[PDB]
Amino acid sequence: RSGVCGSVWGQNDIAYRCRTCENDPTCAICVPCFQNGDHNSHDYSIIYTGGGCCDCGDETAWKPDGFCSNHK
Amino acid sequence: RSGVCGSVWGQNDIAYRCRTCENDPTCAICVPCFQNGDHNSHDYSIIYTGGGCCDCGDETAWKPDGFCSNHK
Ligand SMILES: [Zn+2]
Ligand SMILES: [Zn+2]
Ligand SMILES: [Zn+2]
Ligand SMILES: [Zn+2]
Ligand SMILES: [Zn+2]
Ligand SMILES: [Zn+2]
DSSP: OOOOOOOEEOTTOOEEEETTTBSSTTOOBOHHHHHTSOOTTSOEEEEOOSSEEOOTTOTTTBOGGGOOTTOO | OOOOOOOEEOTTOEEEEETTTBSSTTOOBOHHHHHTSOOTTSOEEEEEOSSEEOOTTOTTTBOGGGOOTTOO
16 A cells, blocks of 8 residues: 555665564564664564565554654 | 565655555555556556555455456
């Protein structure tokens, strides 16, 4: 598909998985969204998803505690 | 989030909306997926979504009759 962050990354591009904040293992947020949130204690990792759309601000894909400062 | 087409486009990039195949107005497929499908009769439009992920092959976002030849 096409406030929620509209950022996107490509096949070779990195993003962040956070197992604490994710609704399911396919969820992920862009680097700026991760850096503007607080995951210090969380089980996070840099990934190459092979592309995707950022789930920051999407209550159905990400826990609101894990939203960055700019998306809710 | 990050079978289904994994293609992506950015803020300035075009994609296709197809009102016949879409599950909702936010759904969209990349240009190659549109060209490798059959939408001749359909109510389609070229859009600038401000970025997104291709819904081709996702049955929750796109009608399977509208899948391109390469995603089931
Ligand atoms: Zn983001
Ligand atoms: Zn964010
Ligand atoms: Zn987190
Ligand atoms: Zn169509
Ligand atoms: Zn596609
Ligand atoms: Zn396709």
